[PDB]
Amino acid sequence: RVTFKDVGGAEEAIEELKEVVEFLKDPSKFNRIGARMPKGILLVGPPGTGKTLLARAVAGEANVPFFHISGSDFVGAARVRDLFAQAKAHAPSIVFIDEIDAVGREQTLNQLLVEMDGFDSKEGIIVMAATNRPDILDPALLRPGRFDKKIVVDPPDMLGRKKILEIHTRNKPLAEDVNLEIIAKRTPGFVGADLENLVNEAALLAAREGRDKITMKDFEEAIDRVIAGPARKSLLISPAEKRIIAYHEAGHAVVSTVVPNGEPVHRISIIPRGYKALGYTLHLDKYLVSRNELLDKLTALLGGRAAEEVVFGDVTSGAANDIERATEIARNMVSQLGIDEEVKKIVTNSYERAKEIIRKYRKQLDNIVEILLEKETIEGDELRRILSEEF
Amino acid sequence: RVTFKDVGGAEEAIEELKEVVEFLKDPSKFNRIGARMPKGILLVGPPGTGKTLLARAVAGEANVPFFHISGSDFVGAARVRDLFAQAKAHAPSIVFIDEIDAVGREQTLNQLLVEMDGFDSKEGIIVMAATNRPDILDPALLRPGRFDKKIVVDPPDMLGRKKILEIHTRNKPLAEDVNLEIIAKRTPGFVGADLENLVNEAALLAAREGRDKITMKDFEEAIDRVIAGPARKSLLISPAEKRIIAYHEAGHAVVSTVVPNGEPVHRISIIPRGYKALGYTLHLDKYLVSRNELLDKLTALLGGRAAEEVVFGDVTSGAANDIERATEIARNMVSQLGIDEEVKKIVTNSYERAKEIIRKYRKQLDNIVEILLEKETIEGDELRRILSEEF
Ligand SMILES: Nc1ncnc2c1ncn2[C@@H]1O[C@H](COP(=O)(O)OP(=O)(O)OP(=O)(O)O)[C@@H](O)[C@H]1O
Ligand SMILES: Nc1ncnc2c1ncn2[C@@H]1O[C@H](COP(=O)(O)OP(=O)(O)OP(=O)(O)O)[C@@H](O)[C@H]1O
Ligand SMILES: [Mg+2]
Ligand SMILES: [Mg+2]
Ligand SMILES: [Zn+2]
Ligand SMILES: [Zn+2]
Numbered sequence: 001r002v003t004f005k006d007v008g009g010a011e012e013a014i015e016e017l018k019e020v021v022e023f024l025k026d027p028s029k030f031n032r033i034g035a036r037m038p039k040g041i042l043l044v045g046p047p048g049t050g051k052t053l054l055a056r057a058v059a060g061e062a063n064v065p066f067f068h069i070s071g072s073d074f075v076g077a078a079r080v081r082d083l084f085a086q087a088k089a090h091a092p093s094i095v096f097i098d099e100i101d102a103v104g105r106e107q108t109l110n111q112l113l114v115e116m117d118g119f120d121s122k123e124g125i126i127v128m129a130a131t132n133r134p135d136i137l138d139p140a141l142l143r144p145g146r147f148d149k150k151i152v153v154d155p156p157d158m159l160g161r162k163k164i165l166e167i168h169t170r171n172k173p174l175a176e177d178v179n180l181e182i183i184a185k186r187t188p189g190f191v192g193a194d195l196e197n198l199v200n201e202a203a204l205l206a207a208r209e210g211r212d213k214i215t216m217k218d219f220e221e222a223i224d225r226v227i228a229g230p231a232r233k234s235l236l237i238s239p240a241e242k243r244i245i246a247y248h249e250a251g252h253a254v255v256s257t258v259v260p261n262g263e264p265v266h267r268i269s270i271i272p273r274g275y276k277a278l279g280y281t282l283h284l285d286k287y288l289v290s291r292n293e294l295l296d297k298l299t300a301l302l303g304g305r306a307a308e309e310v311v312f313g314d315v316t317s318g319a320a321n322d323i324e325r326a327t328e329i330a331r332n333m334v335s336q337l338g339i340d341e342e343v344k345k346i347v348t349n350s351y352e353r354a355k356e357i358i359r360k361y362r363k364q365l366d367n368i369v370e371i372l373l374e375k376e377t378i379e380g381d382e383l384r385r386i387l388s389e390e391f
Numbered sequence: 392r393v394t395f396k397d398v399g400g401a402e403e404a405i406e407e408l409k410e411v412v413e414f415l416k417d418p419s420k421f422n423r424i425g426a427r428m429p430k431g432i433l434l435v436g437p438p439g440t441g442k443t444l445l446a447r448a449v450a451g452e453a454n455v456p457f458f459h460i461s462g463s464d465f466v467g468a469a470r471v472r473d474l475f476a477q478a479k480a481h482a483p484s485i486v487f488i489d490e491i492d493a494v495g496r497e498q499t500l501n502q503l504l505v506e507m508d509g510f511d512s513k514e515g516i517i518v519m520a521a522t523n524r525p526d527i528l529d530p531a532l533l534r535p536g537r538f539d540k541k542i543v544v545d546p547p548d549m550l551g552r553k554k555i556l557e558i559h560t561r562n563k564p565l566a567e568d569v570n571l572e573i574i575a576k577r578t579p580g581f582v583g584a585d586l587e588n589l590v591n592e593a594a595l596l597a598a599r600e601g602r603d604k605i606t607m608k609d610f611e612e613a614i615d616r617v618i619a620g621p622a623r624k625s626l627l628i629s630p631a632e633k634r635i636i637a638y639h640e641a642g643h644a645v646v647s648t649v650v651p652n653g654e655p656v657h658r659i660s661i662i663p664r665g666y667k668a669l670g671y672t673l674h675l676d677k678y679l680v681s682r683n684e685l686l687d688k689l690t691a692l693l694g695g696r697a698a699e700e701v702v703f704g705d706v707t708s709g710a711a712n713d714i715e716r717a718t719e720i721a722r723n724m725v726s727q728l729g730i731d732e733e734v735k736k737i738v739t740n741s742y743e744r745a746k747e748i749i750r751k752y753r754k755q756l757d758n759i760v761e762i763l764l765e766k767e768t769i770e771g772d773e774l775r776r777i778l779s780e781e782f
Contacts, residue, residue: 019599029601034563035594150621275621282621287580288632289708338711 003060007053008167008192009160016151017058020126024062024092027124038149039121043130044280045153048193051130054153055096058128064092071099076108084115092124100129104138116146134280142283150282152275155191158184158376164195172203175215183219187236188270188376194234198222237270242373244308245270248318250368251307251358252300257391258357261296265387268368269377279321291337294329298350299357301326306354307365326350364390394451398444399558399583400551407542408449411517415453415483418515429540430512434521435671436544439584442521445544446487449519455483462490467499475506483515491520495529507537525671533674541673543666546582549575549767555586563594566606574610578627579661579767585625589613628661633764635699636661639709641759642698642749643691648782649748652687656778659759660768670712682728685720689741690748692717697745698756717741755781 004014023030023037030037043051059066067087069079087093103109119125129147131137141147156164162184169180187195201222206214226234237245249268256262272278286293305319330346358365367390372378378386395405414421414428421428434442450457458478460470478484494500510516520538522528532538547555553575560571578586592613597605617625628636640659647653663669677684696710721737749756758781763769769777 019595022599022601030595030598033594033598033603033605035598036591037595148622152621284623285626286632287626287628288635290635290705291707292703292705336708336711337706338714 001060002053002057004057006167007050007057008163009156010050010054010153013054013151013153017054020058021061024058024064024094024124024126027092027122031122037121037126039116039145040127040129040147040149042134042147042150043128043153044134044150044275044282045132046155046191046278047132048191049153049155050192051153052098055094055128055130059094062092064094065090066094066096068096068098071097071101071103074103074105074108076103077111080108080111080115084119087125088119088123095125095127097127097129099131100141101131101133101136104141109138113140113146134282139283152278152280154273154278155189155271157269157271158188161187161190161195164192165199168196168199172199173213175213177216178214178219179216186223188242189235189237194226197233198226201225242270243369244312244314244316246369246372247307247311247365248304248316250365250372251303251305253303253368254361254365255303255306255354255357256300257387258361259296259299261293262300265383266380267378268372268383270372271376289336294333294337295350298326298329298347299353301329302351302354303358306351306358310355310358310362323347361391392451393444393448395448397558398441398448399554400547401441401445401544404445404542404544408445411449412452415449415455415485415515415517418483418513422513428512428517430507430536431518431520431538431540433525433538433541434519434544435525435541435666435673436523437546437582437669438523439582440544440546441583442544443489446485446519446521450485453483455485456481457485457487459487459489462488462492462494465494465496465499467494468502471499471502471506475510478516479510479514486516486518488518488520490522491532492522492524492527495532500529504531504537525673530674543669543671545664545669546580546662548660548662549579552578552581552586555583556590559587559590563590564604566604568607569605569610570607577614579633580626580628585617588624589617592616633661634760635703635705635707637760637763638698638702638756639695639707641756641763642694642696644694644759645752645756646694646697646745646748647691648778649752650687650690652684653691656774657771658769659763659774661763662767680727685724685728686741689717689720689738690744692720693742693745694749697742697749701746701749701753714738752782 007014020041043054045051056066065087067083069083083095087095097103104112116127134150162180165180165183187198190198198219202214202218205218205221206212226232227236249270253265253268256265267273275282301322305315305322308314308316308319326347327343330343333346334342368386371386398405411432434445436442447457456478458474460474474486478486488494495503507518525541553571556571556574578589581589589610593605593609596609596612597603617623618627640661644656644659647656658664666673692713696706696713699705699707699710717738718734721734724737725733759777762777
């Protein structure tokens with residue numbers, strides 16, 4: 001049995017799931033005013049971030065049964081039928097499906113659609129699923145009444161990684177020289193699954209020497225063992241890669257602050273945070289189409305690529321995604337504001353515009369990167385103040 | 392079962408459909424004087440405006456059966472045959488087809504044309520269809536005797552949005568501080584489908600806290616949830632976009648009032664209202680062709696584009712449609728009143744003429760925009776009076 005005390009660095013996701021817990025505890029409070037709940041919820045994120053652990057914590061916060069099946073184990077139609085029959089016999093319950101993209105061969109899919117339409121939501125039943133490849137799902141699953149809510153689960157930041165280390169060392173004897181805050185600063189790019197395996201390695205080092213406490217030297221030796229060798233499990237960002245990433249993020253923020261139509265900036269970080277930054281489209285944005293605001297949007301979208309070329313003469317895979325999105329926007333502009341030759345010149349002009357801004361404001365770019373390399377994240381209150389002294 | 396009491400902001404469309412209700416209740420009153428009814432009717436409008444709901448309200452006002460099929464589900468010929476056979480067995484009835492542009496692959500289309508020609512209109516049978524892409528329909532469907540009547544369904548205005556909110560809150564308990572008139576003023580650009588989803592969101596906020604009434608704070612928090620995030624459904628016009636739109640509409644009205652041949656102005660609004668304003672040609676205008684009236688028509692058609700350039704130095708997608716229509720008119724002028732070099736200079740001269748009027752009457756332009764930004768619409772009685780004090 002697990003609850004929300006076993007989860008670290010997922011504050012925003014836990015905030016959206018509070019409504020589901022209230023519904024499962026007493027459905028009648030929703031029915032008496034006509035509030036209608038969704039039938040399916042989708043969790044999307046990279047592997048090892050704790051999507052299976054979040055679903056089990058919902059069923060623990062409310063004492064309800066938990067029926068589950070894995071989509072990688074696929075007689076298939078008969079198994080789906082049995083799963084939904086059990087959930088109906090116990091009114092408030094949860095149905096969970098893992099690796100849904102594997103199963104959604106055509107007889108099994110049809111049975112699931114039939115089962116989704118054939119149960120009553122007012123009884124207190126809800127279905128959950130998880131995946132890390134949301135863009136290959138069948139469009140029939142996402143139609144209204146089947147799977148209409150989505151929640152994003154992100155990799156942790158420095159304060160999130162420290163919380164996960166504390167959760168998994170509360171039953172282990174530690175020496176007095178252990179500083180979990182220093183250990184967190186040395187593992188950017190780790191996820192919760194990597195951090196849980198690191199604690200086991202440090203305990204094996206102590207046990208093999210007969211000691212009864214884990215020291216600070218054990219933790220530092222375990223980091224090197226999990227990132228190299230014939231048996232490696234984890235990747236981390238090196239100091240050289242950290243510098244190139246910092247310049248890419250600061251290039252976006254500098255260009256936005258200079259163009260008149262640019263949007264406000266609220267956060268800069270080394271770890272990706274949104275669904276766009278994670279590479280998802282989610283099968284998905286202004287009422288009015290104007291020439292001046294579309295050109296300022298193109299210039300700011302190329303700010304990361306322009307800082308890489310003026311400082312390093314290189315190009316990364318993130319900058320290649322940016323150049324692809326820009327071409328799509330320019331193509332739609334030509335067909336609405338008044339062919340391939342025209343699209344190519346629009347993108348070229350915006351790229352030249354961004355490089356002049358980077359050159360003219362090179363001093364402010366350097367100052368921001370230095371702060372980022374030591375803090376790893378700048379938030380709204382501090383970011384707003386910092387941007388004032390510069391510029 | 393639904394009737395005309397479940398529909399808001401569609402007064403003009405409901406006025407045209409009253410004839411259809413009388414015909415279905417007693418066909419003999421039309422036959423005894425030789426009045427001949429159309430065989431098909433077409434509803435055209437943006438998605439979510441309630442075209443499917445209007446058809447079901449016609450079949451409820453008169454107690455007649457309602458046979459329907461969706462064109463996005465396309466054996467096809469056999470299904471069309473069955474649908475029309477059922478309708479004949481019950482004399483006064485309705486046949487409805489949704490997403491007709493999807494189905495109108497060639498065997499299905501031929502069967503529909505055969506069925507349209509093979510039923511007797513005097514029995515009390517009529518066919519209805521709906522679409523939001525009227526300009527890609529096959530020309531064979533629109534010939535006389537098949538689909539010869541069209542009705543336009545528009546997005547709602549401020550008073551229309553207030554009526555839809557009242558329809559969907561008549562079974563819900565509301566607090567005493569709720570003011571549906573203030574909520575309507577804060578959602579320009581919403582349609583009836585967006586407004587129905589907003590009421591469900593405000594009820595979920597109240598239920599998750601255990602309360603038994605919906606307060607004014609719930610409604611204001613629901614607006615922010617539906618316009619942003621990984622799960623967004625609606626778009627609204629922002630205060631910055633509102634100002635640019637107001638100047639475009641007032642530029643047309645000012646130029647018309649000054650040129651001697653300009654047409655009278657009856658209405659100005661922020662929401663589009665006609666079929667021309669919605670971007671439809673409808674496969675469709677004076678008996679006499681004169682030089683002076685054609686030049687005054689060109690100058691007034693460029694008044695919206697001229698106000699954008701003199702006040703903001705920008706250009707929108709609506710102004711690009713205007714410049715395209717102007718070129719077509721000038722091209723036809725050259726071939727009738729006495730080549731590409733000639734057309735280009737005619738359009739350039741008219742554009743220069745309109746900019747001088749905007750500069751010379753800048754004071755009256757500003758006064759009209761201020762009233763529009765607070766009322767959102769000026770009608771004939773008030774508009775006529777207002778235009779008198781100015782000028
Ligand atoms: N935030 C977290 N706090 C604590 N443990 C975590 C967290 N995230 C992941 N873990 C650990 O990750 C291990 C496995 O990850 P889990 O299966 O829960 O995630 P997942 O995203 O569903 O992964 P996968 O795609 O591999 O199935 C669990 O044992 C749990 O200990
Ligand atoms: N004027 C209105 N009054 C009340 N409800 C409305 C109105 N217009 C739309 N709706 C709501 O819109 C919802 C769906 O829209 P509907 O299918 O009737 O319109 P449509 O134009 O045919 O849409 P679509 O293109 O999506 O099929 C209905 O549940 C109805 O509640
Ligand atoms: Mg797992
Ligand atoms: Mg519909
Ligand atoms: Zn980038
Ligand atoms: Zn115009």
